[PDB]
Amino acid sequence: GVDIRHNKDRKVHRKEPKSQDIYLRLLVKLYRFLSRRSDAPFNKVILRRLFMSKTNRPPLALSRLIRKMKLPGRENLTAVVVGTITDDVRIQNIPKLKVCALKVTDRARSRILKAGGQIMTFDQLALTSPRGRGTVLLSGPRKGRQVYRHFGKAPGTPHSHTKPYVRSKGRKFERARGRR
């Protein structure tokens, strides 16, 4: 026999979108052809995110997309995001965005188009930019869910700052012995 541990032979990486969506699996059939033959590091990152789940594809608000486009060097590039571009109602101006995403909400689609912008899809992106040139791949706040506020050391340890699971946030709910 051979002295080797088979504990971590399997690499747990999603190699196929767990969704049975038809249009999403067609984009996978498109970017798998580019991840093999285009020889561009952009298509290899879009292919991963087409597999990822909804929690690994968080929304991207307009304000969080506008600020990343106003950085120096993003003059006439595209804002690629594998997910939904939600609207940020507490922002006012839209500076002529050129985005490309799977879904765009009805208000975000209106504010981008009314400002003269352009909204694309991942099939049009692979048509005009097969190498992925002139793109700015963005993402949303993956650690922005309420679920991550409960993850930590423990609610009852020093320097925890972890949100405990309670039925209702009140006075008689876990504030007596250990919180003072």
Binding site: H150, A154, P155, Y165, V166, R167
Partner: protein, 52 residues
């Protein structure tokens, strides 16, 4: 009973709740019973408004 991080549940199922359970299987038939009562009342007060 507890295993790891979770809520402290309080399911009030310590009485004999199985003897007092009301199933809403007559909910759609009760809409027809109420509606036919409004139509029957409407014909009884035909010249008068039905809402009251």
């Amino acid at each position: 009973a507890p295993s790891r991080n979770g809520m402290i549940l309080n399911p009030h199922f310590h009485k004999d709740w199985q003897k007092r359970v009301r199933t809403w299987f007559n909910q759609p038939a009760r809409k027809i019973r109420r509606r036919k009562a409004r139509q029957a009342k409407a014909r009884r007060i035909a010249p008068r408004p039905v809402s009251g």
